[PDB]
Structure 1
Amino acid sequence: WNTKEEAKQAFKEALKEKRVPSNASWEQAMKMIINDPRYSALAKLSEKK
């Protein structure tokens, strides 16, 4: 992604796919896409943005 906001949107989408609890922290939310190779692109993007 070339836009930080668009990156955040992609994260939220993956968070929905990972059924991330609304009471879960941002860090915990990212862990769901970090441990999942399928979203490794977003795991790195979260550091790029």
Structure 2
Amino acid sequence: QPAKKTYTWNTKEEAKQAFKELLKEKRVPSNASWEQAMKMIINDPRYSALAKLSEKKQAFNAYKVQTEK
């Protein structure tokens, strides 16, 4: 196809994993707002790892709690 490469997810852990790993690669800070983290991660196809934005936010919030303390 005329474009970049797309990722594919089948298990909730894999999709949630790409979203969390997506924030890690985006260096999202633990104090980033869903807007800053979501945009920095949406630019990446990993954002498609989650079909619901509510789960996308839970993974982002969990991502900050995993890179804090």
Report the TM-score, using the length of structure 2 for normalisation. 0.43
Distance 1:43 1:36, change over 3 A: farther
Distance 1:6 1:48, change over 3 A: same
Is the CA contact (8 Å cut-off) linking 2:19 and 2:50 kept in structure 1?
yes
Distance 1:28 1:5, change over 3 A: farther
Between 2-11 and 29-38, the greater mean CA deviation after superposition? 29-38
Distance 1:4 1:28, change over 3 A: farther
1:13-43 CA-partner distances (Å, limit 9, x unpaired): 1111110011124453221122346867778
Is the CA contact (8 Å cut-off) linking 2:50 and 2:56 kept in structure 1?
no
Give ranges in structure 2 of 5+ residues lacking alignment: 1-8, 58-69
Give ranges in structure 1 of 5+ residues lacking alignment: none
Say which one has the larger Rg: 2
Distance 1:46 1:20, change over 3 A: same
Say which structure is richer in helix: 1
Matched length = 49
RMSD across aligned positions (CA) = 3.9
Tell me the percent identity. 98
